[PDB]
Design a protein around this ligand. Structure first.
Ligand SMILES: [Zn+2]
Lengths: 93, 49, 214, 51, 84, 155, 652
RNA sequence: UAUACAAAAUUGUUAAGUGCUGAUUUAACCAAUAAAAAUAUAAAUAAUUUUACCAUUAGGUA
């Protein structure tokens, strides 16, 4: 029994197999850098939220200024992006 | 079947019969029907004669 | 100790002695009571005590508190004593009290055959649910086996002595084959039906009521 | 199902082999065959001599 | 309407006062309840001699009959020693 | 009290602490719960502390007492939120309030000789007395202390 | 619109079939999503490998000659398919051939690579938690397909629905953690498919999380389907899960939309799906009826939609079951069509339907507002016995509700006399209140009705109760005593009311006055009138117009006492003053009759999710602590067993 | 050769700490679990399941 970042109490074997390498702040630093610090709950942050978290959360874009709602699993596994960025790219090219 | 419970079963049967007689009673006589014939008899099979 | 716990769970003030001071209150006066300025002026004699003889008649609120006792109290206290705040023991007692209300013979009837059957079934359900999340509890496995055997005995006795309630319970809770012979080898020798004779339940049907004995 | 059937048939073959009694020791098999790796491997293709 | 009384406990009408327990001892409770039912209006109490419920159950020995009193239903639940 | 919670948190700014407390209260209310009392004990000097979010072994923390009346299903969610909150350095949950501690260990006679209603109705302060409080204060409560506390500085 | 959608989909599918036949003759107008699966199963079971693997044990003649030859002295290993066994009694409790221990998960771990996960879940002993199961599979590094992932999620869902209502959150969190692990495990190859998403939706439905289920997992499945063409086709199972979630959450519009989508996608629905659709239509109709009672699709339109759903049931050649009959009866009760309820019951009884007790519940509830059906109710109750069913408190409550609504009384009396007393069950306060309401509101009541009401009240008091209908029950009892002339019984019920502590009511006093008025024969006089009329002043109870009428009736029945005359004058003045203050005179409002549907009649049973098969097969590993040497030992048998033993008594 | 009778508990939870992948040791609250069919004569009332770094392993160097 170990706590993820001394926060999330999980069993040792399951933590070493799945929990530890699948954290957004650890596995995808670039994706986690776009985490929204105000609209998201204070109990939810990339240090404990996994890659496959299907419940949508707030993302603040890095290229432009836009806060949107996207799930972590869609953003990382299936591939997601800023709707404003993609529509601007469509408008440009 | 276990034979040690015969006395208890006799007591229960007596009580059940007494309750039946006390409550249900007898709602009038019933005409006696003529008895039929029984296929099941003892001994060896008999000839058709 | 288990019988004391069950007696306290079923009855209101059995733990209170005639002196109205429990042993724990004797040894820890401060932890048992506190000082309150507001006098119990609204609280007079309970004129509704006739409808709450045992705890099983009041499983709507926490600590089996009758609804009439919460009159001059705030909605916050009512919500704090509502059903959602009841503990696991309180909810289990609420379930068993509902079943006792359904299958009770009198106010203080806790040992009816149907009540025993439903209590055994609830105990089996609780033990199985515990083993669902904790499959490495050997003592719980043994307790579950014992409870299942006791439930089987209670269900067979209830089936033989009162078929109406047994059939109603079976239909309501969908356990149609709850009483089935385990082994064909023993069943074909009539050892599953010899149980009824050996248990003193052979002749108990009231044949006239359900059929024609002629 | 194919693999499971093959394993079951192998288990049956082991049960049948149990008829032969205890197996003999190594030297019987060792002296049974004077075959060499050369004759073993020439069946597929002739390998060139080492250089 | 018929309720079958299965077992000697149910035939003898055990109260089963203890919650969810049928094999608990009840003789002490029944004895105390009979003591309560006793009357302290001329109200002669009952002596401590062992009694019988029916007058016909008195011993045929005239000397032994002096040691037995005819008590209607308080004669039950007699004794101080428990099952060893 | 149903549940008590002592939260040892990093002494962040007033706005951040207020936001964390507001989130805790909103979660408690949304999960169908009630808060008996929320109190701030200020910033103290614990013997040993080690932050988890900042990984800084420094002895500076703030203590907060939170009394709740919530069911187990929702109390699990509330405990998870409190423990996973980045600001909450250490949360300790007192669930031994409605029942005295170790009555079973104490004696078999005391196992079923307690009335849970007294402890449930009393607040956590009366359940666990503070060093400064006393039964002398409790008895002064009902002694009409206003009319007597008049010569307390007569000398 | 569902019938129009069905016919449009049928014609469009026929047109597409004809077009593709011309491009490349009877064909089904729909598409069956289970025919290919059953065909694959049939081909698998008829394949020679399966037939050779699952074959009967070799006979002695087949094995060899007589015995004594090792290897050919016993039948070889026999393997059995648990789902389709070629033998009866797979397990046995012999001494040397016990195979129950050889059915636990540890033995299947060896062949976990070839293992069928659904078969393992359904037939195995001492299985670990589903999370540990998934962890063990991943540790063994086996390529879990969609069927295996769905089987694991279904095992988790079985655990969820087994657990109590207040214990679902932790299991749902375990399910979502397993889903995340399956998503993020790249090696070994693990695919999350339509079946797995449907099983997650089923878990969400079982827990009761519409927001977490509909907007997350169904949305993810739809996004996967649109992203990957034909690689994520949505089967009938996914939409069945969607309808289950809609039924669990009470969503009716979403369920109708999902069913319409199924119809439009040119694939046949399921019987369970149509039952869920009928249940949702019943919910919509009940909500509409509640809104109308308070006084927005038209009621005629929703009735037509229900009818067209029932027609589609046979349009797709879907067999109807007991659940289908129950759902259709509930929908027809919601839409107030007792004729269609009776027709449905007749149709079910016609070919082959085991009618459940809920079907008769709905049958009795459908005709609550219809007269001339007491004989039908009695015949239904009589026919319950030959069908293997027994009446219960819910059915008796519904019957007495009908009796109270029809104010017949004689029917309720006959029902109690010839059905209920044999049941020997504890009556409920609602049942007693309905019986007394019928027996009071009936015409020409009899003293046997009073006797039955007193017996029911005594039995109800003797048994326990949680609800509180004591005041209306005694009010209706006093009204019955007023109609019958039982002034003594009406006055004696006051002691029971006092013992319960309930306050007296002006309606109760009016009933007492009416009893005094119409009990000229038995007993009652001016003294009784004065004693009753001394209540309003002493108990500070407001008088009423019914009070004035009853006191005038009592005056005309017995005479003119000065106190009665003064009370009449003062009550007339007070009624005039109240009329001046308001607009209409006050009156004793009648006690409302319960007409709630049988599904919300305070069922006295929570849940028993037990399994006799698991109990007999000793799943989860029960233990009995068998006796040891006590049974085995028999003592020395050198001689015969004689009384007092061989050496009676011994000194050491 | 024949006979002589030669429940201070478990599971889970949580806290610390050593290790540095499994692992891994102790303590505490809380949760679940103690009795409940007929009969002692009733001749089998009974189930077929479960459980730091080296040197040698306690010696040094750090
Ligand atoms: Zn952007």
């Amino acid at each position: 029994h170990i706590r993820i970042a001394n926060r999330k109490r999980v069993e040792m074997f399951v933590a070493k197999r799945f929990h530890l390498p699948t954290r957004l702040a650890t596995a995808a630093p670039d994706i986690a850098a776009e985490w929204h610090d105000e609209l998201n709950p204070m109990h939810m942050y990339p240090a404990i939220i996994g890659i496959g978290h299907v419940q949508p959360v707030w993302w603040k874009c890095a290229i432009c200024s836009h806060s949107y709602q996207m799930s972590v699993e869609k953003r990382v596994v299936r591939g997601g992006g800023c709707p404003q960025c993609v529509v601007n790219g469509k408008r440009a090219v | 079947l276990k034979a040690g419970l015969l006395g208890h079963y006799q007591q229960e049967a007596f009580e059940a019969r007494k309750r039946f007689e006390e409550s249900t009673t007898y709602p009038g006589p019933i005409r006696a029907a003529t008895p039929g014939d029984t296929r099941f008899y003892s001994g060896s099979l008999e000839s058709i004669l | 100790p288990v019988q004391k716990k069950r007696q306290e769970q079923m009855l209101y003030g059995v733990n209170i002695p005639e002196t109205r001071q429990m042993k724990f209150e004797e040894q820890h006066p401060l932890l048992a009571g506190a000082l309150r300025k507001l006098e119990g002026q609204p609280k007079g004699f309970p004129f509704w005590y006739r409808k709450y003889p045992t705890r099983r008649h009041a499983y709507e609120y926490r600590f089996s508190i009758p609804v009439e006792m919460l009159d001059g109290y705030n909605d916050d206290v009512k919500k704090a004593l509502s059903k959602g705040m009841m503990s696991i023991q309180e909810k289990q007692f609420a379930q068993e009290a509902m079943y006792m209300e359904r299958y009770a013979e009198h106010d203080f009837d806790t040992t009816s055959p149907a009540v025993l059957a439903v209590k055994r079934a609830l105990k089996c359900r609780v033990l199985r649910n515990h083993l669902l999340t904790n499959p490495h509890n050997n003592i719980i496995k043994t307790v579950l086996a014992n409870t299942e055997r006791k439930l089987n005995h209670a269900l067979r006795r209830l089936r033989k002595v009162d078929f109406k309630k047994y059939w109603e319970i079976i239909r309501d809770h969908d356990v149609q084959d709850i009483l089935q012979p385990p082994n064909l080898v023993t069943y074909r020798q009539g050892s599953y039906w010899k149980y009824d004779w050996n248990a003193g339940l052979a002749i108990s049907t009231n044949l006239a009521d359900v059929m024609d004995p002629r | 199902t194919q693999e499971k059937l093959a394993a079951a048939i192998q288990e049956h073959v082991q049960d049948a082999y149990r008829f032969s009694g205890p197996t003999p020791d190594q030297p019987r098999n060792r002296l049974a065959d004077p075959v060499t790796f050369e004759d073993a491997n020439n069946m597929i293709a002739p390998n060139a001599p080492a250089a | 309407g018929h309720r079958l009384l299965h077992g000697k406990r149910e035939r003898e009408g055990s109260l089963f006062a203890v919650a969810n327990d049928v094999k608990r001892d009840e003789r002490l409770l029944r004895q105390q309840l009979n003591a309560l039912l006793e009357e302290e209006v001329p109200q002669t109490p009952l002596v401590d001699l062992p009694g019988v419920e029916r007058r016909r159950d008195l011993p045929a020995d005239p000397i032994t009959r002096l040691f037995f009193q005819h008590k209607g239903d308080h004669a039950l639940y007699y004794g101080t020693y428990d099952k060893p | 009290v149903f549940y008590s919670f002592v939260l040892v948190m990093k002494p962040r700014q007033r706005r951040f602490t207020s936001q964390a407390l507001r989130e805790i209260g909103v979660a408690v209310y949304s999960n169908g719960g009630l808060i008996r009392s929320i109190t701030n004990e200020g910033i103290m000097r614990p013997y040993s502390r080690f932050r988890d979010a900042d990984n800084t072994p420094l002895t500076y923390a703030r203590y907060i007492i939170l009394q709740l009346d919530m069911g187990e299903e929702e109390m699990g969610k509330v405990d998870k939120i409190i423990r996973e909150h980045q600001d909450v350095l250490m949360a300790l949950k007192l669930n031994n309030l409605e029942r005295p501690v170790g009555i079973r260990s104490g004696n078999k006679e005391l196992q079923a000789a307690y009335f849970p209603l007294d402890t449930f109705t009393r607040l956590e302060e009366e359940i666990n007395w503070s060093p400064q409080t006393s039964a002398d204060i409790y008895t002064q409560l009902e002694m009409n202390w206003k009319e007597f506390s008049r010569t307390r500085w007569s000398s | 619109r569902l019938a129009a959608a069905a016919v449009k989909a049928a014609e469009w599918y026929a047109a597409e079939n004809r077009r593709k036949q011309k491009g490349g003759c009877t064909a089904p107008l729909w598409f069956d999503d289970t025919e290919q699966n059953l065909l694959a199963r049939e081909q698998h079971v008829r394949s020679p490998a399966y037939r050779e693997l699952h074959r009967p044990a070799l006979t002695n003649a087949a094995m060899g000659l007589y015995g004594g030859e090792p290897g050919f002295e016993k039948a070889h290993r026999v393997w059995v398919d648990p789902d389709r066994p070629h033998i009866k009694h797979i397990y046995n409790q012999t001494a040397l051939a016990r195979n129950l221990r050889y059915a636990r998960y540890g033995y299947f771990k060896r062949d976990m690579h070839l293992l069928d996960v659904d078969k393992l879940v359904r037939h195995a002993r001492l299985l670990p938690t589903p999370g540990r199961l998934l962890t063990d599979f991943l540790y063994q590094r086996v390529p879990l397909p969609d069927k295996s992932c769905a089987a694991l999620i279904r095992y988790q869902r079985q655990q969820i629905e087994m657990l109590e209502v207040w214990g679902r959150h932790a299991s749902f969190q375990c399910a979502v953690e397993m889903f995340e692990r399956m998503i993020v495990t790249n090696i070994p190859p693990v695919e999350v498919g339509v079946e797995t998403h449907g099983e997650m939706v089923l878990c969400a439905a079982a827990c009761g999380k519409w927001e977490e289920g509909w907007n997350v997992y169904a949305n993810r499945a739809r996004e996967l389907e649109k992203e990957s063409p034909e690689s994520f086709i949505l089967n009938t199972f996914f939409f069945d899960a969607l309808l289950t979630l809609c039924v669990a959450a009470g969503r009716v519009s979403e369920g109708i939309d999902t069913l319409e989508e199924v119809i439009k996608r040119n694939l046949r629905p399921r019987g369970t799906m149509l039952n869920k659709a009928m249940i949702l239509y019943s919910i919509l109709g009940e909500q509409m009826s509640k809104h109308e009672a308070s006084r927005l699709c038209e009621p005629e339109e929703v009735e037509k939609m229900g009818l067209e759903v029932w027609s589609l049931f046979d349009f797709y050649q879907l067999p109807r079951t007991t659940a289908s009959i129950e759902a259709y009866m509930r929908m027809c009760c919601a839409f107030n069509k007792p004729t269609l309820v009776l027709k449905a019951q007749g149709f079910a009884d016609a070919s082959d339907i085991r009618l459940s007790i809920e079907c008769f519940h709905w049958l009795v509830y459908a005709i609550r507002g219809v007269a001339g059906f007491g004989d039908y109710v009695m015949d239904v109750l009589s026919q319950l016995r030959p069908r293997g069913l027994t009446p219960d408190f819910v059915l008796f409550t519904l019957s007495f509700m009908y009796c109270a609504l029809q104010r017949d009384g004689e029917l309720a009396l006959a029902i109690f006399d010839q059905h209920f007393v044999h049941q020997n069950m504890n009556p409920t306060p609602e049942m007693v209140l309905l019986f007394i309401q019928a027996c009071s509101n009936c015409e020409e009541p009899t003293a046997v009705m009073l006797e039955r009401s007193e017996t029911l009240i005594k039995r109800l008091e003797a048994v326990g109760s949680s609800v509180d209908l004591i005041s209306p029950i005694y009010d209706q009892f006093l009204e019955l005593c007023a109609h019958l002339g039982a002034v003594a019984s009406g006055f004696s019920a006051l002691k029971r009311i006092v013992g319960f502590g309930k306050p007296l009511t002006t309606r109760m006093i009016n009933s007492l006055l009416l009893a005094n008025s119409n009990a000229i024969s038995s007993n009652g006089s001016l003294s009784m009138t004065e004693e009753l009329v001394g209540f309003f002043t002493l108990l500070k109870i407001r008088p009423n117009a019914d009070t004035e009428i009853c006191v005038n009736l009592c005056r005309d029945a017995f005479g003119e006492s000065p106190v009665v005359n003064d009370f009449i004058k003062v009550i007339g003045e007070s009624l005039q003053g109240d009329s001046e203050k308001g607009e209409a005179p006050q009156y004793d409002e009648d006690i409302p009759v319960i007409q709630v549907p049988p599904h919300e009649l305070r069922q006295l049973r929570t849940e028993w999710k037990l399994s006799p098969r698991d109990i007999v097969l000793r799943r989860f590993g029960q233990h009995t602590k068998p006796p040891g040497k006590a049974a085995l030992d028999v003592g020395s048998m050198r001689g015969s067993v004689i009384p007092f033993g061989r050496s009676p008594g011994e000194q050491l």
